[PDB]
Amino acid sequence: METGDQRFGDLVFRQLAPNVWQHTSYLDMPGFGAVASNGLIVRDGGRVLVVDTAWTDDQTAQILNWIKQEINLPVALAVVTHAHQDKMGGMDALHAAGIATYANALSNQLAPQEGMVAAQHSLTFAANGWVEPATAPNFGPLKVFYPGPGHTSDNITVGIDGTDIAFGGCLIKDSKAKSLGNLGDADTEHYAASARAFGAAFPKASMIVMSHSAPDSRAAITHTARMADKLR
Amino acid sequence: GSHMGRPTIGQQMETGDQRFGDLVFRQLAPNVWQHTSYLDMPGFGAVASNGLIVRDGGRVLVVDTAWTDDQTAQILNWIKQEINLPVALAVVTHAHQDKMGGMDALHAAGIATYANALSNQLAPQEGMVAAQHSLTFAANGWVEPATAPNFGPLKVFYPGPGHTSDNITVGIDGTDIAFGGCLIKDSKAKSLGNLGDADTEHYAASARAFGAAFPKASMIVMSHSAPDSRAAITHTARMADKLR
Ligand SMILES: CCc1c(C(=O)O)c(S(N)(=O)=O)c(CC)n1C
Ligand SMILES: CCc1c(C(=O)O)c(S(N)(=O)=O)c(CC)n1C
Ligand SMILES: [Zn+2]
Ligand SMILES: [Zn+2]
Ligand SMILES: [Zn+2]
Numbered sequence: 213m214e215t216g217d218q219r220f221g222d223l224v225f226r227q228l229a230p231n232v233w234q235h236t237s238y239l240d241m242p243g244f245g246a247v248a249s250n251g252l253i254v255r256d257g258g259r260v261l262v263v264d265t266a267w268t269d270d271q272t273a274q275i276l277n278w279i280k281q282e283i284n285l286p287v288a289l290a291v292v293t294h295a296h297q298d299k300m301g302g303m304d305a306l307h308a309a310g311i312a313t314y315a316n317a318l319s320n321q322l323a324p325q326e327g328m329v330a331a332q333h334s335l336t337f338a339a340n341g342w343v344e345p346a347t348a349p350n351f352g353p354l355k356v357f358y359p360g361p362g363h364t365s366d367n368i369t370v371g372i373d374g375t376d377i378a379f380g381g382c383l384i385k386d387s388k389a390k391s392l393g394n395l396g397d398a399d400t401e402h403y404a405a406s407a408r409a410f411g412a413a414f415p416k417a418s419m420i421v422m423s424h425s426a427p428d429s430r431a432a433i434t435h436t437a438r439m440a441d442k443l444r
Numbered sequence: 445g446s447h448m449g450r451p452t453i454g455q456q457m458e459t460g461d462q463r464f465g466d467l468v469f470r471q472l473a474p475n476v477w478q479h480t481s482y483l484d485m486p487g488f489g490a491v492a493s494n495g496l497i498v499r500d501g502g503r504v505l506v507v508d509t510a511w512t513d514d515q516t517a518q519i520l521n522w523i524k525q526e527i528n529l530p531v532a533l534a535v536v537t538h539a540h541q542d543k544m545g546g547m548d549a550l551h552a553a554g555i556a557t558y559a560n561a562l563s564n565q566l567a568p569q570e571g572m573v574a575a576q577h578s579l580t581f582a583a584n585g586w587v588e589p590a591t592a593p594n595f596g597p598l599k600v601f602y603p604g605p606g607h608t609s610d611n612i613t614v615g616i617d618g619t620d621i622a623f624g625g626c627l628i629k630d631s632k633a634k635s636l637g638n639l640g641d642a643d644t645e646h647y648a649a650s651a652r653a654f655g656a657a658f659p660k661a662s663m664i665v666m667s668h669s670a671p672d673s674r675a676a677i678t679h680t681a682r683m684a685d686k687l688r
């Protein structure tokens with residue numbers, strides 16, 4: 213309800229930069245109430261790129277229809293940042309709309325176990341965390357980085373070239389957080405290193421976008437790593 | 445860095461096994477041998493780690509180091525004596541001491557080394573030397589063949605997270621042998637061994653995925669016990685079912 217925020221159905225959109233919006237969707241978790249999840253919408257000349265679905269097919273369709281209304285450019289592809297419902301719940305809606313989908317090979321391998329629909333294409337990563345470029349064709353400003361196991365074994369991150377923005381997804385929590393949120397599938401040993409690897413991959417990003425709070429500064433990365441140091 | 449921060453000899457000699465310094469070698473097939481090295485761990489005696497040696501035409505291929513550099517050098521010495529073909533490459537099956545502790549011995553000898561990209565990424569944290577090359581995997585677990593150059597009969601499969609998030613497995617094409625490494629424990633096991641780095645949620649599926657990937661392998665080779673039948677896979681998966 214913050215000024216400049218736009219509503220379409222159950223979804224809220226905030227412009228972060230001339231060509232970048234955050235999408236926010238909400239799901240009731242019985243016992244804990246409504247939980248926000250954020251992803252990104254990127255205008256890349258005469259096409260649109262999506263990072264992460266909403267919780268549900270219906271909510272993901274609302275994202276696609278808002279893009280049609282407000283941006284009116286075709287969605288070329290989507291990248292989804294791990295096999296949990298907040299990031300991949302809406303895969304069927306992307307596929308029905310004829311959007312090409314990309315995830316970590318590991319995300320696609322885990323998807324069935326995690327009750328998610330696999331992406332059509334698999335990203336693979338060098339030992340240094342950077343996507344093998346042949347697996348991420350025509351990704352325009354999307355720079356995809358695998359920081360290592362943290363929130364999950366499969367979690368990936370995305371920088372937006374020509375912006376100050378990097379997307380930590382569920383790996384990064386906000387700079388005032390008490391906790392690292394859901395650690396059910398987490399690597400408690402490697403998490404802190406993974407948070408720091410994300411920071412080092414995108415050294416000049418000043419706006420850190422994450423799944424479960426409003427955009428923060430780089431302080432979110434060093435706070436997440438400081439919290440993660442305490443897990444081991 | 446390493447979880448281990450004490451090399452010894454095995455006691456249970458066994459008839460068809462060959463002692464070579466502090467290591468043990470067993471021929472499993474005309475072109476396949478098991479290498480075994482031992483660490484004394486207080487309260488648990490001589491702890492075996494097993495890997496594989498494969499002869500493929502005029503080349504030898506190695507799966508896994510020994511626990512230590514000095515032990516891994518003795519694997520190379522044994523290969524020179526018993527096979528006398530050059531070691532074309534080694535593949536190591538995750539970033540733990542038993543599987544990657546001897547990387548320096550391979551690199552010293554000019555042997556090209558391969559691991560899961562994730563193993564190489566985790567190596568520094570795990571106190572291991574990274575392999576020279578990284579394997580990547582398709583969404584169905586099979587190695588991307590462009591990343592496994594001249595692997596010949598070594599058929600590398602990532603079964604999913606289990607013993608660790610980076611554990612890989614290796615079928616030996618043209619044989620009845622599949623290597624489960626530390627993912628699979630034998631049908632006599634009372635535990636899944638070290639779960640310090642394990643994925644308790646996905647372990648059972650990963651164990652079953654290994655079995656389904658190598659459906660006709662009748663000899664299952666694993667890190668910490670003698671080769672077993674396919675029962676080792678199902679018994680492991682059923683123990684892993686109790687973690688979730
Ligand atoms: C807000 C904390 C949170 C997370 C998280 O920390 O990322 C997830 S997730 N992506 O499923 O693990 C959930 C859904 C169960 N919740 C409630
Ligand atoms: C014999 C059980 C075992 C395992 C295992 O279960 O694989 C490992 S490992 N590869 O480091 O996790 C060790 C060394 C700590 N030990 C003693
Ligand atoms: Zn998650
Ligand atoms: Zn999340
Ligand atoms: Zn899970």
Ligand SMILES: [Zn+2]
Pocket residue numbers: 538540607608626638
């Ligand atoms: Zn291990």
Ligand SMILES: [Zn+2]
Pocket residue numbers: 540542626667668
């Ligand atoms: Zn082991």
Ligand SMILES: [Zn+2]
Pocket residue numbers: 401447570641
């Ligand atoms: Zn570890």
